[PDB]
Amino acid sequence: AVDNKFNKEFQNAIYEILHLPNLNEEQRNAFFQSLKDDPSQSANLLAEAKKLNDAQAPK
Amino acid sequence: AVDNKFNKEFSVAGREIITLPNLNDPQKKAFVMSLWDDPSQSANLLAEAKKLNDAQAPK
């Protein structure tokens, strides 16, 4: 099921992590590698990335 | 090392796709997933994306 929760969360994490503007290059690459290594962790990885993005907003 | 040529090349091409302002979200998602699955397609996908972006410019 290409549209089940697992797969939608994986695709969405790739797409949304690619968008997050306040990740640096190394951090972004680490998230992508983590997604590839364990797609079951996609929603958790996205949540982690979004928090980090907000922590690293210009101030 | 996760901060490598593979993740960098994906990140650079993917960011070029998603920063094209006139694409819709489904087009950008589909291009990004194709890139994820087949890096050999990067130049092809970037060129298709740019052609669609120009065609969908505001009127």
Side-chain angles (χ1 to χ4, degrees):
Chain A
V2 307
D3 54 342
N4 66 13
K5 175 167 163 216
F6 186 109
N7 286 313
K8 284 180 166 141
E9 289 178 346
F10 180 50
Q11 296 193 329
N12 183 252
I14 297 161
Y15 187 69
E16 291 301 337
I17 290 171
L18 182 64
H19 278 78
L20 289 169
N22 306 324
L23 301 183
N24 75 27
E25 292 161 277
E26 185 272 340
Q27 293 165 337
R28 198 195 309 286
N29 284 343
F31 278 113
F32 291 140
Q33 193 59 53
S34 292
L35 288 170
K36 188 69 175 178
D37 286 347
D38 193 349
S40 79
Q41 290 291 310
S42 288
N44 287 340
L45 287 162
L46 176 57
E48 177 186 352
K50 287 193 167 314
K51 292 168 181 168
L52 180 60
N53 180 82
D54 295 347
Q56 298 187 156
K59 55 187 176 177
Chain B
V2 304
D3 196 14
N4 63 48
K5 72 187 177 185
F6 305 105
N7 291 324
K8 174 163 188 187
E9 275 147 25
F10 172 75
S11 290
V12 168
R15 294 278 307 166
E16 184 170 318
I17 293 160
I18 63 158
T19 61
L20 288 165
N22 313 319
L23 298 179
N24 64 47
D25 276 301
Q27 284 167 332
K28 291 177 273 190
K29 290 170 174 165
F31 288 139
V32 168
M33 297 308 120
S34 291
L35 182 64
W36 179 271
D37 286 342
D38 191 359
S40 75
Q41 299 302 307
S42 188
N44 292 339
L45 288 165
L46 293 169
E48 187 49 28
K50 178 59 176 172
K51 190 178 177 189
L52 283 174
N53 178 78
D54 292 358
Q56 295 174 181
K59 292 157 181 192

